[PDB]
Amino acid sequence: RDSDFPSILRRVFYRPYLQIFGQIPQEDMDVALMEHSNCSSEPGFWAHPPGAQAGTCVSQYANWLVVLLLVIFLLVANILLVNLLIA
Amino acid sequence: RDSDFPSILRRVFYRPYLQIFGQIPQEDMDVALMEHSNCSSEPGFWAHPPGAQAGTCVSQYANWLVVLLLVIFLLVANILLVNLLIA
């Protein structure tokens, strides 16, 4: 919900970049680790991420896909790209 | 503001050294993750880092450059130097 332009750029580039160095904020992306609150007037279910620079309210519609994307991101970046660069 | 000589040496060498091993204290360097307080009599905007050995008050003038420097540091040290040593 806090979709300012710097916030969008941060959550699109800076947070995934830090995930490559062991900085994985599960509480800001995994809805099962958040408290489910009615913080959005839009239809659907929402949860409150505790992070300061998170959106303070996120959708839980397909959060399993967010978790799967994190798994795939870690595989592709922390394992494949780094080892390829080593080679 | 807490610029003692051991504190300066710590924040200049020891903290960046630990960043190479996954110890990245974002709350002590990223002003967006701090609370903005009027803890300095000098002109400008200031924020309070929660870390014990941080300066308890830091400038937020060009904190985007601090974030960019962290990004570049991680790239140069955790990726380039380590893989070069492996080779």
Protein topology:
This is part of a larger assembly, with two copies of chain A (87 residues).
Chain A (H helix, E strand, L loop, with lengths): L4 H15 L6 H4 L5 E2 L9 E3 L9 E2 L3 H24 L1
Antiparallel strand pairs in A: 1-2, 2-3
Strand order of the largest sheet of chain A: 1-2-3
Largest interface: A-B, 13 and 13 residues
Q: Major β-sheet of chain A, in short?
A: 3 strands, antiparallel
Number of separate helices of chain A: 3
PDB class: transport protein
Keywords: trpm4, Ion channel, transport protein
Entry title: Cryo-EM structure of the human TRPM4 channel in a ATP bound inhibited state
Chains A, B: Transient receptor potential cation channel subfamily M member 4
Please characterize this protein's 3D structure:
The structure is cut from a larger assembly and holds 2 copies of chain A (87 residues). With 87 residues, the first copy, chain A, is mainly alpha-helical. Chain A has one domain. Helix content of chain A is 49%, strand content 8%. Chain A has 3 helices and 3 strands. A 3-stranded antiparallel β-sheet of chain A has the order 1-2-3, with no helix packed on it. The termini of chain A are far apart. Chains A and B meet through helix 1 and helix 3 of A and helix 3 of B.
Short note summarizing the structure:
The structure is cut from a larger assembly and holds 2 copies of chain A (87 residues). Chain A is mostly helical and 87 residues long. The first copy, chain A, is built from 3 helices and 3 strands, in the order ααβββα.
